[PDB]
Design a protein around this ligand. Structure first.
Ligand code: HDD
Ligand code: HDD
Ligand code: HDD
Ligand SMILES: [Ca+2]
Ligand SMILES: [Ca+2]
Ligand SMILES: [Ca+2]
Ligand SMILES: [Ca+2]
Ligand SMILES: [Ca+2]
Ligand SMILES: [Ca+2]
Ligand SMILES: [Ca+2]
Ligand SMILES: [Ca+2]
Lengths: 675, 675, 452
C-alpha cells in the first residue's frame, strides 16, 4: 500500500533538517546574548518557512469533515449486471477511504450545524480508484451544475460581513429557495432530522444521480446507489444540536473516531435500485432529474456488499484534508447519465484539486494513489514525484514499441462509454419540461413522516424563516411552501405573523413512501457506543458505589459510560463543570446524589439538575436508580409514569428497562403538536 | 540506480489514468461521429490538464543548464581540519549530483553564450545533504547580496522589449559595470576565454566565498573551494561560439551527456586553500570580499578528493530541472563567513524554491531528498508526501518522550556555528573600507594572461562596447577600464571611436599569479572525447577506404570520429549539409576528396571548403591525409609549413602528428595582435 | 484604457518599499562593519523576495514570442453576414494586441528556428474581448485535440537529456510524423520557407479552423480567418537561419520593434472565406478537418478590415509575457464548429492560465482586462483586485433586484450558440471516415511551389 511506504517514525532519534542534517530548533542565532537575530540562521528560517506555509485552501464546499479507512466486501459475483471488477466475486475485498462532512461551513465550524452532509467513498479497486461522491440526502437542491455557485453563494455567509457561519437561517438562502423551486425537495429533507443526524454512523449515503451498470457485453441498466446504515437512522433535536455546536464542535468526528478505536467500526450495506433503460420516464418523473427519488415501492434494493470502516488516520492533514475525490474516478462496468447536475460535476472535481494542491500532481499524494500500476504519458508539472523511464511519451510511437497500449471495450479491460447511449436534437441551453414538477415529491416526503416528525420540520422552518429580515422574502417563501402543503404554509406563517396564501392544490396528494422517516424506522438495531451519563456525588460513599455497579452492568453491553461528580477521583470520568446533556444519549441519577438536585464553587449554579432536565426535554431515556426516586423526579418536573422515565431500586431491572429505552432512542410524546 | 525507488516503467502494459483505470487517449468522446466533444470525457480532460500544467518557472538565474549523477571519494581522513563526515576516511564515497549552467539566459538559450557559468554540487552525505553552489570564475561582480537584482536586471534583456537574450552586449549592462567598479574583476574573467569554455568538463568550479572548516573541538580555519578539472582548461574563440550558438544551442549538455555514455565521465580534484583566522586581512585585501582571489603563490591547493560524474539522468525535468540547491544545505564541520554576498544568498535560495515548486515541500522531491532519515516537527503544506506518526510535534514535550532530541556541538552530531565567531560595533548599512580597491586584482588577472590571450580579452571588450548606443556610457566604461590598465583603455577606445582618458596609475602594477591563464596552462592532459571530422566523398571509393582506415586508428585512442560526405551510407556519419567546423576539434580531409574543395543540390555552395577554412581560422589542427595536399591547402589559403597543419601520406604518421595538435588544442599564432 | 491607470513613473523621486516607505537598497544592515547580515533588514528581504519570485512558468507551447499594440478598422457594415459589433460600421476602430511566436522552443530560444509560428490577435471590442489565436500556416498537424500532448512531446526535446532545443530534427518527431499521417500537410508547410519567415511582418495569420459567422436573425455561415500581409511574403534560407540563430536570437522581435519605432508599423488585411453550411462536405474533404485548406479557387477572400500594429509595449513582462489568449474569448456574431481540434482547445486555454498566473483572477491583469464594464457573480480567489458592491451574487435573487440580468439571443446582446446546430448518433470515440485522406492536400501544396 502506498501509505505504508510514506510513514515516518519520530519516536526516536535526533532532530534533523528536511535534508537530514542534525540541528536544534529552540533558540535563534544572535549577535550577542541580548543581540539581534542573524539572517544566516537556516535552522530558524526552514522551520518558520514550513510553519508559514502549513495551510492549504479549504474545500470550496464540504470543508468541515472527517474520514476513516476500511474495507468493502462483495456479497456475490455481479457479472450478470456489471463488469465492475471490485464486484466480480463472492468475498472479494477492496480497501476504502470515506470522508463525511457538512456542506456550507468553513473548516472549524460545528459538526451539528443543520445542513446536508457528504458521504464520499473511495474504492481502491484492482482496475482503478472508484469514487462515489454522495450525500446523506438522496436528492439535490438544483437540476443543473451551472447553478451550483448560485446555490452555494446564497447559503454561505453574506459576503459584506461574512455572517452567518454554517447556517441557511438568513435572507439570501431563503431568497434563493423561494426563487428556485427545484430546491423544495432537498430543503424539506434538510429541515427534517436528516439535517441534524446523531452521527455519521446513523445516516445513510446516496449517489443521488442515476448512474449506469454496464455489462462486458455492452448492455446497460440504470441504477441508484444507496448505502444503508447497519447502526440505524437517528437524529438530534434542534435545541440539542445548537448547544452541542458550542459545547463540542467536533461531536461527529469524535463519535466516528471513538467507535473505530473501540472495535465498533460502522457498517453499511452497499445497495442499488436497478431499472431498465426503458423506465427512464416510467415512474412519473425523469431519472435524469436529481431532485427525485425512485420510491421504495417502485424498485427494491439489491444488496451488493458490505462497507466497514475500522481504522482511523495516522495524520489528519496528510490523509483526510488531502483526499481528493472525483466522480471522474470511474471504472469499467460503470457509466454516467445525461443528468445535467452530474455532467457538470465531472469538470469541477478535476479542476478544484489544482486550487487545493497548488499543482497538477495531486494524484501522487499517497491517499490519492491507486493500488495498481500507472502507465501513461502524463509528465512533469510542479511536485513531480515519479522518475519516468519511458523517454518516448507519445502515441503513436515505434521508439517505445507502441507502449503504453490503448485500452477499450475490446482489450486491456478499458473503460468504455455504454455503447447504447445516444444524443439527438439542437444544441440548446434549455431545461427539459420533464423536470418541471418541483413540488409533488417534497409532498411525498412530508406525507411519509410521523406527526411529531412533521412538527419538527415545521418548527425548523419557523425557526429559520423567523430570522429572515425581508418581509418580501418571507412572503415569497410562504408562496413556495404553500405549493407543497397548505397546512405547512399555514403553520409556518403563524410563527412569523403573516397570512399564508390560499391553498393551490395542483401538486397536493396523500401518497406516502417507505424508508424516509427517521422517527418511524423502528428501534435502533444496536446500542453499542451509545453514551450513558451517570450523575453522582463525592459527598456520599453510597452514590459512588451505585455508580460503579451501574458502570459494570452497562459497560458489559458496549455502552460508553461517564460517571459525573463535583470533582475527579478514581471511578469518576467528568466534573459537573465540563458535563452537559448533549454529551449523553441517556442520563441516570443515582439516588445517593439526590441532595445536588435542589450551589458550589466547582460548577455553575443548578448544573446537576440542568443536565437531567435538558436530557428529559430533548426526548432521552432518563431515570433515577436506587428506590428513593420521587425526590429527583419531582425537582425535575419529570413524571414517574412517563414513557422513557425509569424508577427502580433494583440495579438489574433498571438497566434492563433503560437499555430498551436507549434502543427506542427518542421519546417523542414529550413534544407539543400544532392545532 | 540512485533514485531507483522512484522510477516508473512503461515498457509494458495498457494505458491507465493516474488512478490506474485502463483508458484510451487518441480520440475525444463526441455526440455523433461529426459531433461536438463531451464535457464527460474525463480521459481528455485529465490528459490535457496534465499537459496544460507541465511547466514550472525557470530559475531566476542559471536557468539554462544540465546535470549528471556521480560519486565523490575522499583521499584521506580530514578530521584534523574538519568534522565533516563525508571527508572523515580515506576512500569514503558519497553520491553527488551536479548541475552546470550559464547565468543570464533563459531556459532555451544557447550553451555557448559569453557568460559566467554555474557549477553546483550536491553531496548526499551520511550526515545530510551538503551543497557547494559555485561558478567557473572565482570572483563575483558585487560585494553585497542586496545588489544582486541590480546586477541581474542590468545584464538581462532590456525590460521594454526583452532584447537581448543571453548577452552583456547592451547599454544597461555596461552602464552598471561602469557605475559599479567592484564589477571589474569578474568582468575581466568573463571577457577572457573563461566566458566561453569548450565544455563543462574543461572548466573549473569555485565556491567564490571564503567559508570555514570547523573541527569537532570548535577551532576553525578559513577556506576557499576549488574544483580542478582533470580534463584541462580550454576555451572556444568568440566567432566559433557565435556560430555554435546557432548550429548547436545544446553543445555543452550534449558534450557532457556523450562523455558519460561513452565511459569518459569527467573528473575534478576537489581542493581547498586553508588559512588561519588571523590571515583574514594579511594578503592586502579582505577574505570577506568576494571580488578577490587568494593568489596561488600565497596559499597552496590541498586536494581533498575526487569528483567523478558517470551517470546521466533518467528524466531531465524530474532530476535536472527540479534539483533545488541551497548554500543553506550545510553540514557539521562547515560554517559561513561574514561575506555580505554569501550572507544574503542564504535567504534567497530557501525562498526561491517556493516560486519554483509552488509549495513548501520541495525537499521531498526525489532529487532533493536526503539519503538518511528525517526527524522533525515540520508538518502539512501543499504536496505533503509523508504520513507522520508522531502526533505530538512540538518541543518541549513529554507525550512523545522528548523526541526528537535537540542536536548541537555536544550531542547528536548537531551543526554548530563556529564558537570563536563574534560581532562588535554599530548596526550599520555601510561598506567596509577594506573592500575599496576594485582595480588591483583585475590588473593582476590581465598581467597573468599570454599576449594573444590579452588580445582576445581586448577583442571581446571591443565587440561588446561597440554595440553600446550611449556615448556617455562608453566614456564611463573607458574611465573604469583605464583604472585597471591604460593600455586596455587605449586599445578598446580605438575600436569605438573615442579617446581613452589620461593614465591614472593609482592601482597599476606588474604582479602576476599562476593558474588563471587558459592559453598558458599547457597541452590538454587527455584528448579522449575530442572530435575529429574527416571530410570525404562518395564519388571516389578510395576516399571512403582512406576515411575508414583513419577512423580505426583515431578511435583506438578514444577520439570521436565523424566521417562526412555528400550523402549517408555505411561508414559515413553526417552529410555536408548538416556538418560544421563548430562540430569538430580537428578537421582532416582525405586526399581522394580533393575535387570537392573548389556546387551540389545536397549541400550549400562551398560547404566542404568552408568547414576546413573555418577550422583553420578558429585555431584548430587541420590536415590532409594521403600525400596530395597542395590542392586542398591552396584553395583554403592554408600554408603547408603552418603550425598545426599536417600533410602525410602515411596514416600512422598523420595520426601521430595530428594527436599532438589536438592536445595543443589551439594554434594561437593565427591571431593578429595590436601594435 | 485599463493599462493607463496602471502606468508607474520612476523618472523622479526617492526609492520606496512597495508600501510607500522611503528606503535604501544598496547595502545590507549588519552587526558591525565586517559583521553578519541582520534578519531585521526588511529592505533587503522585500527586494530579494521580489527578485526570487520574478519568474512565471513559460507557456506550454509558443513560449518564445513578442507582441505589440495596435488598431483594427472595419472597412464596412458587415451586419448582413455577422452580428459582431466590432464589424458593424464602416470606419469603426477597435484596439488590438498581437503576439507572434514559435511553437516548440523554450524562452530564450532563437526566433529563426524552423517551426510553425503563432499569430494571436486580441480585439478589445465594445461587446467584450475577442481572440483569434492563429498560426502562420493554415493547417495543423492533428485532427483531435486529445493528441496535442503526443505531438508536442514528440517535437520538443527528448525528455532524458532535453536535446534538441527548438527543432523537429530528431528521431521522436519523425517517429510521430511517420506514425501519424495526418501530420503530412503541416509538415510540408513547416519544411517550406513558411517554417523560416523573414519576419513576423512577412508572414500571414490563419485561424486554421472553420468557424461560424452568425447573424442577429440566427442564420449562420462557415468561415476561415486569413490575415494577409501588406508587407509581402518572404523567407530566410535555412543556412542563413542557422547562423542568425547564433548571431541574433532576437532577430524577429527586434525587426518588429524597430519597424514600429520608425513609423513603419506592419499591416494586414483581415479577411474570410465564407461558404454556406451545406458546403461542409462539398469540396472533397470535411470543413471540420483542420488538416485541410479551402483552395483559393473554391472560395475567394472577402476583406473585412485593416489590422495595423503601431505601438510597442512599455513593459514586456507585464504586457507581452502576461497576455493570456483564449479561443473561448468569443463575442456575439461568432460561433464554434464541431472541429475536434478546436473543441478541445476551448478547455485548454482556460485551464492553462491557472498554471501561468498561479491563481484564477488572470483576466484582471491590465493586458487581459476588457474596455467595457464587467457584471457577474464570480468572486474571491487569490489576487482578487475588485471590491464588489453587490452582496447578493446569486441568480435568481430578489435582494439585488435580479441583477445581473441574463443575456441571450433576445436580451442584453448575449452570446448564443448558432440555433441551427444539432447533434445525432451514438456517443463515440471514433474518427470520421471523412478525415481519412492525409496525403492529397500535402501533394496539392507541393505541386504549387516553384521548382527551386
Ligand atoms: C458543479 C459543482 C458541484 C456540483 C453541482 C456538486 N458539487 Fe460536490 N463538490 C464540488 C462541486 C460540486 C467541488 C467544488 O468540486 C468539491 C469541493 C472539494 C472537492 O474535492 O470537490 C465538492 C465537494 C463534495 C464533497 C466532499 C468530498 C470530500 O469529503 O472531500 C461531497 C461529499 C460532494 N461534493 C457531494 C455532491 C453531491 C452528492 C452533489 C449533487 C448530487 C454535488 N456534490 C454537486
Ligand atoms: C541575493 C541573491 C543571489 C546572490 C548574491 C547569488 N545568487 Fe546564485 N542564485 C540565486 C540568488 C543569488 C537564486 C535566485 O536564489 C537561485 C536561482 C535558482 C535557485 O535555485 O537559486 C540562484 C542560482 C545559482 C546557481 C544555479 C544552481 C543550479 O544549477 O540550480 C548557481 C550555480 C549560483 N546561483 C551561484 C552563485 C554564486 C557562485 C554566487 C556568488 C558568489 C551567487 N550565486 C550569488
Ligand atoms: C489541446 C491543446 C491545444 C491544441 C489542440 C492547440 N493548442 Fe494552442 N495553445 C495551447 C493548447 C492547444 C495552450 C497550452 O493552451 C497554450 C499555451 C499557453 C496558452 O495561453 O495556451 C497555447 C498557445 C497557443 C498560442 C500562443 C498565444 C500567445 O502568444 O500567448 C497560439 C498562437 C496557439 N496556441 C495556436 C494554436 C493553433 C492555430 C492551433 C490549432 C489549430 C492550436 N493552438 C492547437
Ligand atoms: Ca443574508
Ligand atoms: Ca468509449
Ligand atoms: Ca539595454
Ligand atoms: Ca582563450
Ligand atoms: Ca529524439
Ligand atoms: Ca523559400
Ligand atoms: Ca501556486
Ligand atoms: Ca445558447
Amino acid at each position: 500500500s502506498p501509505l505504508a511506504a510514506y510513514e515516518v517514525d519520530d519516536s526516536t532519534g535526533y532532530l534533523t533538517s528536511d535534508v537530514g542534517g542534525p540541528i536544534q530548533d529552540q533558540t535563534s542565532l544572535k549577535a550577542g546574548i541580548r543581540g539581534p537575530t542573524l539572517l544566516e540562521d537556516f535552522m530558524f528560517r526552514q522551520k518558520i518557512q514550513h510553519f508559514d506555509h502549513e495551510r492549504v485552501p479549504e474545500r470550496a464546499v464540504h470543508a468541515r469533515g472527517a474520514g476513516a479507512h476500511g474495507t468493502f466486501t462483495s456479497y456475490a459475483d455481479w457479472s450478470n449486471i456489471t463488469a465492475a471488477s471490485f464486484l466480480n466475486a463472492t468475498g472479494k475485498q477492496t480497501p476504502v477511504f470515506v470522508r463525511f462532512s457538512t456542506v456550507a461551513g468553513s473548516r472549524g465550524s460545528a459538526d451539528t450545524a443543520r445542513d446536508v452532509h457528504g458521504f464520499a467513498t473511495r474504492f481502491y479497486t484492482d482496475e482503478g480508484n472508484f469514487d462515489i461522491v454522495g450525500n446523506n440526502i438522496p436528492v439535490f437542491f438544483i437540476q443543473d451544475a451551472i447553478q451550483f455557485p448560485d446555490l452555494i453563494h446564497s447559503v454561505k455567509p453574506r459576503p459584506d460581513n461574512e455572517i452567518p457561519q454554517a447556517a441557511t437561517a438568513h435572507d439570501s438562502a431563503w431568497d434563493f429557495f423561494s426563487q428556485q423551486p427545484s430546491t423544495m425537495h432537498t430543503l424539506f429533507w434538510a429541515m427534517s432530522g436528516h439535517g441534524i443526524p446523531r452521527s455519521y454512523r446513523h445516516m445513510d449515503g446516496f449517489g443521488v444521480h442515476t448512474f449506469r451498470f454496464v455489462k462486458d457485453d455492452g448492455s446497460s441498466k440504470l441504477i441508484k446507489w444507496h448505502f444503508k446504515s447497519r447502526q440505524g437512522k437517528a437524529s438530534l433535536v434542534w435545541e440539542e444540536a445548537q448547544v452541542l455546536s458550542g459545547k463540542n464542535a467536533d461531536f461527529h468526528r469524535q463519535d466516528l473516531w471513538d467507535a473505530i478505536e473501540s472495535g465498533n467500526g460502522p457498517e453499511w450495506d452497499v445497495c442499488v435500485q436497478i431499472v431498465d433503460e426503458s423506465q427512464a420516464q416510467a415512474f412519473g418523473f425523469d431519472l435524469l432529474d436529481p431532485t427525485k427519488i425512485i420510491p421504495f415501492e417502485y424498485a427494491p434494493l439489491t444488496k451488493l456488499g458490505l462497507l466497514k470502516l475500522d481504522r482511523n488516520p495516522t495524520n489528519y492533514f496528510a490523509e483526510t484534508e488531502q483526499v481528493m475525490f472525483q466522480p471522474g474516478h470511474i471504472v469499467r462496468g460503470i457509466d454516467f447519465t445525461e443528468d445535467p447536475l452530474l455532467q457538470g460535476r465531472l469538470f469541477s472535481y478535476l479542476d478544484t484539486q489544482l486550487n487545493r494542491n497548488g499543482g497538477p500532481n495531486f494524484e501522487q499524494l499517497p491517499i490519492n494513489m491507486p493500488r495498481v500500476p500507472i502507465h501513461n504519458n502524463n509528465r512533469d508539472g510542479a511536485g513531480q514525484m515519479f522518475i519516468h523511464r519511458n523517454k518516448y511519451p507519445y502515441t503513436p510511437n515505434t521508439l517505445n514499441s507502441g507502449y503504453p497500449r490503448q485500452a477499450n471495450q475490446n482489450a486491456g479491460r478499458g473503460f468504455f462509454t455504454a455503447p447504447g447511449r445516444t444524443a439527438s436534437g439542437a444544441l440548446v441551453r434549455e431545461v427539459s419540461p420533464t423536470f418541471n414538477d418541483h413540488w409533488s415529491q417534497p409532498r411525498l416526503f412530508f406525507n411519509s413522516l410521523t406527526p411529531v416528525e412533521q412538527q419538527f420540520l415545521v418548527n425548523a422552518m419557523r425557526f429559520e424563516i423567523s430570522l429572515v429580515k425581508s418581509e418580501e422574502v418571507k412572503k415569497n417563501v410562504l408562496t413556495q411552501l404553500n405549493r407543497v402543503s397548505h397546512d405547512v404554509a399555514v403553520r409556518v406563517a403563524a410563527a412569523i405573523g403573516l397570512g399564508a396564501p390560499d391553498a393551490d392544490d395542483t401538486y397536493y396528494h396523500n401518497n406516502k413512501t417507505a424508508g424516509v422517516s427517521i422517527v418511524g424506522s423502528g428501534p435502533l438495531p444496536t446500542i453499542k457506543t451509545l453514551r450513558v451519563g451517570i450523575l453522582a456525588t463525592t459527598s456520599e460513599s453510597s452514590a459512588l458505589d451505585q455508580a460503579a455497579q451501574l458502570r459494570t452492568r452497562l459497560e458489559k453491553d458496549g455502552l460508553v459510560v461517564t460517571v459525573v461528580a463535583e470533582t475527579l477521583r478514581e471511578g469518576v470520568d467528568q466534573t459537573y463543570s465540563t458535563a452537559d446533556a448533549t454529551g449523553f444519549d441517556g442520563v441516570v441519577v443515582v439516588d445517593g446524589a439526590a441532595a445536588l438536585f435542589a450551589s458550589s464553587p466547582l460548577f455553575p449554579t443548578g448544573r446537576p439538575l440542568q443536565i437531567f432536565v435538558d436530557a428529559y426535554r430533548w426526548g432521552k431515556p432518563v431515570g433515577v436508580c436506587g428506590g428513593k426516586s420521587s425526590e429527583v423526579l419531582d425537582a425535575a418536573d419529570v413524571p414517574e409514569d412517563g414513557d422513557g422515565v425509569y424508577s427502580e431500586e433494583s440495579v438489574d431491572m433498571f438497566v434492563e428497562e433503560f437499555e430498551k429505552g436507549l434502543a427506542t432512542f427518542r421519546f417523542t410524546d414529550r413534544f407539543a403538536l400544532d392545532s
